[PDB]
Design an enzyme around this catalytic site. Structure first.
Site, PDB file in Angstrom:
ATOM      1  CD  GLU A 143       8.122  -4.613   6.041  1.00 55.46           C
ATOM      2  OE1 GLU A 143       8.821  -4.487   7.086  1.00 55.46           O
ATOM      3  OE2 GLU A 143       8.224  -5.606   5.267  1.00 55.46           O
ATOM      4  CD  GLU A 266       9.374  -5.867   1.096  1.00 53.28           C
ATOM      5  OE1 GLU A 266       9.886  -6.547   2.019  1.00 53.28           O
ATOM      6  OE2 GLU A 266       9.406  -4.608   1.071  1.00 53.28           O
TER       7      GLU A 266
END
Length: 336
Positions: A143, A266
């Site tokens: 991320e 995710e």
């Protein structure tokens, strides 16, 4: 070991996966409360119908000093050992570079420092795994984002997204030049924070328009129901259903429809003593994504403590049983 298969068809095959969360992404495998991973855990995961395991890896503290940035061999071996747990079970595997935002800093000032380090770390990683078949995938970064910045969790600034494109390009070229099957291995790439926000995705560029590159998105939608301990505990209204569907259509009409594969690496919900909502939420999520060719991976950090924050666990790792098989079965219903 490398089939003639397009990314789109490979991602349909993957379908539904499971994250080994708070494990190799932790400073050490057991540092965040998870037990040392066994093949037996992974088997149980496979036994329930999952077709893939994402193995997030944080490298940070196992990286030697500049200029070589040599990765501690013992750590790299362990990463390789766990990957083999997954592959041996006949599942797909994804490895990445996860909580490495301490040295991966997507600003103009820090671009060259991070990128150089990013290149030398991935050279070693790509190389170790160069001879694995197409069931192993590389994800360039987790991320990527400017930690502590105002726009950190809102898509970042153009500066952020701009740098991240070059980080990705550098990693992709690095993988592609490392030999073995790495010329043909599938690779996930995200923009800032792996966000699915459309205006952020505007600035994502596929490195070299590489046809085996997959969009990596994380989407714990809807945020208040899924992540927030003080958010509502109900999900299931007509509005809830139309909402995520509309979110997926955006992703499907922009990427998939035009031949770009997408992986939602995710998603998931915390335990708010609201099993029924979580079960319904889980089924709708898999059905809608998979009916659009999108593979989804549940975030399982091994943490079980009903009503508490961050309670994403489905698998009870120490006892090889499931805390919430109901949720697991729901995912499988949806993926079909």
């Amino acid at each position: 070991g490398m089939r003639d298969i397009s990314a789109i068809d490979l991602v349909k095959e993957i379908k539904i996966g499971w994250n080994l969360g708070n494990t190799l992404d932790a400073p050490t495998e057991t540092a965040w409360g998870n037990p040392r991973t066994t093949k037996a855990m992974i088997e149980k995961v496979r036994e329930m119908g999952f077709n893939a395991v994402r193995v997030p890896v944080t490298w940070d503290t196992h990286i030697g000093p500049a200029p070589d940035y040599k990765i501690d061999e013992a750590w790299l071996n362990r990463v390789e050992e766990v990957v083999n747990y997954v592959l041996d079970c006949g599942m797909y595997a994804i490895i990445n570079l996860h909580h490495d935002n301490t040295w991966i800093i997507p600003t103009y000032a820090n671009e060259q420092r991070s990128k150089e380090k990013l290149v030398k770390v991935w050279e070693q990683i790509a190389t170790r795994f160069k001879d694995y078949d197409d069931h192993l995938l590389f994800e360039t970064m987790n991320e990527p984002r400017e930690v502590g910045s105002p726009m950190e969790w809102m898509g970042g600034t153009y500066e952020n997204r701009d740098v991240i494109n070059r980080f990705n390009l550098a990693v992709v070229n690095t993988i592609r030049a490392s030999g073995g099957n790495n010329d043909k291995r599938f690779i996930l790439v995200p923009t800032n924070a792996a966000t699915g926000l459309d205006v952020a995705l505007n600035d994502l560029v596929i490195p070299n328009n590489d046809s085996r590159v997959i969009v990596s998105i994380h989407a714990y939608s809807p945020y208040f129901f899924a992540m927030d301990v003080n958010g509502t505990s109900y999900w299931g209204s007509d509005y809830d259903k139309a909402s995520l569907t509309s979110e997926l259509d955006a992703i499907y009409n922009r990427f998939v429809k035009n031949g770009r594969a997408v992986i939602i690496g995710e998603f998931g919900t915390i335990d708010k003593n609201n099993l029924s909502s979580r079960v319904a939420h889980a089924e709708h999520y898999a059905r809608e994504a998979v009916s659009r060719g999108i593979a989804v991976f549940w975030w399982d950090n091994g943490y079980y403590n009903p009503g508490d924050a961050e309670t994403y666990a489905l698998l009870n790792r120490k006892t090889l049983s499931w805390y919430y098989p109901e949720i697991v079965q729901a995912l499988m219903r949806g993926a079909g």
